[PDB]
């Protein structure tokens, strides 16, 4: 196999790299949902995403990726890139449809907001922030997909739509008031605080690479 | 305020006037509608800039869908429209996936969708299609929404335009040829090019 002996799938394994400013934006998305649902999971820190053993999990050679046991228990499943990992976790572990959608109607709005030089980058970003600000100014619309509660659409959008990412493009997040309220409110959720804390620490604890016990 | 001819008695697919560079995204949901045999209307939007179209799709692009649920629903952009149509009209799970396992691979290849950045993507597809029995992207046995989403991006026309010889990825060329032979894919490529060149240039058909 040429796969390290410490890589065993006895539960959901989330694949991450060493925590840095630019390495967490995507990996935190599935981790927020795992924390929200209380899904038992391991953390595997990949030393090199170019390693052939990791290409066989995710051929696009990026984190996040997931290996998990199939529902029957026989085989191993794989999910890769943030959007798919959120969809997989919602499928296998969100049985109430709390974050994934309870009916076709709810899943239709969730999937809409889930799947959605400098000035060109900065302008296209402000156009996105504008669409989100508009959505959140609609009557009763506290979250992006559903009015009542946050969904995977909200989790997939938070890393992009928060103060520290706005400052990175040199934008003032205050100028989108409803979106800033929404981002802070997402930020105050227990599962979200935990995800942002843990994802920055991976590779910097007791183990630098491989399967974390802690 | 809507156009008066915009009524939702069934699934309404919002397209634009058919060209070489307008049909790459809207063909995707149309292929699945054709595949499943879903009763649908076609709506040709003159200007996507129009405030009435922004009420349906805030990103102001096609494809978009308006539809009735089991008892009004919107779905915008190709990926979301493919997932909606599968959710509503694919009970069987023939294109959307029958179980957690099938849906894990389908969602992987569905969401995966300058010269170097397109070759890197083609190499991954070529590699997938050279795996034992892997004749479609997501499932070994039959095509899925993942195959529909990827077809317009992985064909000779698209490869040529981006400055690449599609013959360099032989299993991917063969895959796109097999998908091209599908009755529903021919019918969709027909109609998407036809839309806005019939009797009615704009509005409901």
Q: For the stretch B110-144, what's the b/e string if a residue is b when 16 or more beta carbons lie within 10 angstroms of its beta carbon?
A: bbbbeeeebbebbebbbebbeeeeebbbbbeeebb
Give the HSE-up count for residue A31: Cα atoms under 13 Å, Cβ half-sphere. 27
Q: Give B84's contacts in chain A (Cβ within 8 Å).
A: 104, 107-108, 111
- Residues placed in the known binding site of A for glutathione: 26, 63, 82
B154/B176 Cα distance (integer angstroms): 7
Q: Is A101:B63 a contact under the CB 8 Å cutoff?
A: no
A78, A81, A104: residue with CB nearest B112: A81
Kindly report the length of chain A. 214
Residue B35's contacts (CB-CB under 8 Å, 6 or more residues apart) are B95, B148, B182, B184
B80/B90 Cα distance (integer angstroms): 14
**Closest-CA distance of chain B to residue A85, Å:** 8
B138/A180 Cα distance (integer angstroms): 38
Interface of B with A in 47-86 (CB under 8 A): 58-59, 69-70, 73-77, 79-80, 83-84
Q: Is B203:B5 a contact under the CB 8 Å cutoff?
A: yes
Structure tokens at A62: 């990026």
With CB atoms and an 8 Å threshold, state whether A81 touches B124.
Answer: no
Residue B140 sits at the chain A interface (C-beta within 8 Å)? no
DSSP 8-state class, residue A12: E
Structure tokens at B8: 């939702």
- Report the candidate in B182, B167, B73 with the shortest Cα–Cα distance to residue A107: B73
Structure tokens at A109: 């709005």
With CB atoms and an 8 Å threshold, state whether A60 touches B103.
Answer: no
- Report the candidate in B69, B71, B58, B56 with the shortest Cα–Cα distance to residue B13: B56
Q: Is A14:A44 a contact under the CB 8 Å cutoff?
A: yes
Query: What is residue B73's three-state secondary structure?
Result: strand
**Closest-CA distance of chain B to residue A200, Å:** 25
With CB atoms and an 8 Å threshold, state whether A70 touches B100.
Answer: yes
Query: What is residue B61's three-state secondary structure?
Result: coil
Residue B130 sits at the chain A interface (C-beta within 8 Å)? no
Nearest CA in chain B to A95: B100
**Closest-CA distance of chain B to residue A206, Å:** 32
A77, A108, A111: residue with CB nearest B101: A77
Q: At what angle are helices B115-129 and B100-112 packed, to 10 degrees?
A: 150
- Is B176 flagged in the annotation as binding? no
With CB atoms and an 8 Å threshold, state whether B58 touches A105.
Answer: no
B109/B95 Cα distance (integer angstroms): 13
Q: Is A17:A23 a contact under the CB 8 Å cutoff?
A: yes
Q: Is A67:A76 a contact under the CB 8 Å cutoff?
A: yes
B15/A211 Cα distance (integer angstroms): 49
Q: Give A88's contacts in chain B (Cβ within 8 Å).
A: 100, 103-104, 107
> Burial, A63: exposed, middle or buried (Cβ in 10 Å; 0-12, 13-18, 19+)?
buried
Structure-determination approach: X-ray
- Is B78 flagged in the annotation as binding? yes
Q: Which domain holds residue B172?
A: 100-184
A210/A4 Cα distance (integer angstroms): 8
User: In what side-by-side order are the strands of the sheet with B73-76?
Assistant: B73-76, B64-67, B11-15, B40-44, B203-204
Mutation for A interface: B65, B107, B120, B125, most A CBs within 10 A: B107
With CB atoms and an 8 Å threshold, state whether A115 touches B83.
Answer: yes
* CATH number, domain containing residue B161: 1.20.1050.10
Which residues sit opposite B76 in a β-bridge? B64
CB pairs under 8 A between A and B: 87
With CB atoms and an 8 Å threshold, state whether A71 touches B110.
Answer: no
A29/A35 Cα distance (integer angstroms): 10
Structure tokens at B54: 């922004």
């Amino acid at each position: 196999s040429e796969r390290p002996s410490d890589l065993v799938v006895n539960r959901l394994v989330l694949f991450v790299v060493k925590g840095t400013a630019t390495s967490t934006h995507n990996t935190v998305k599935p981790l927020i949902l795992l924390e929200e649902l209380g899904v038992p999971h391991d953390i595997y820190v990949v030393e090199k995403v170019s390693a052939p053993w990791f290409s066989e999990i995710n051929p696009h050679k990026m984190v996040p990726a997931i290996l998990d046991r199939s529902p029957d228990g026989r085989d191993t499943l794989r999910a890769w890139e943030s959007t798919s990992t959120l969809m997989y976790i919602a499928d296998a572990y969100d049985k109430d449809g709390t974050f994934g959608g309870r009916n076709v109607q709810e899943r239709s709005e969730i999937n809409n907001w889930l799947t959605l030089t400098i000035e060109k980058l900065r302008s296209n970003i402000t156009v996105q922030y504008d669409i989100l600000e508009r959505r959140l100014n609609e009557p009763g619309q506290q979250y992006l997909a559903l009015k009542d509660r946050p969904t995977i659409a909200d989790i997939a959008t938070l890393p992009f739509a928060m103060k520290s990412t706005a400052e990175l493009f040199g934008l003032e997040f205050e100028k989108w008031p409803k979106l800033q309220e929404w981002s802070v409110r997402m930020g105050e959720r227990e599962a979200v605080k935990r995800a942002w804390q843990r994802v920055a620490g991976f590779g910097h604890g007791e183990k630098e690479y491989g399967m974390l016990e802690a």
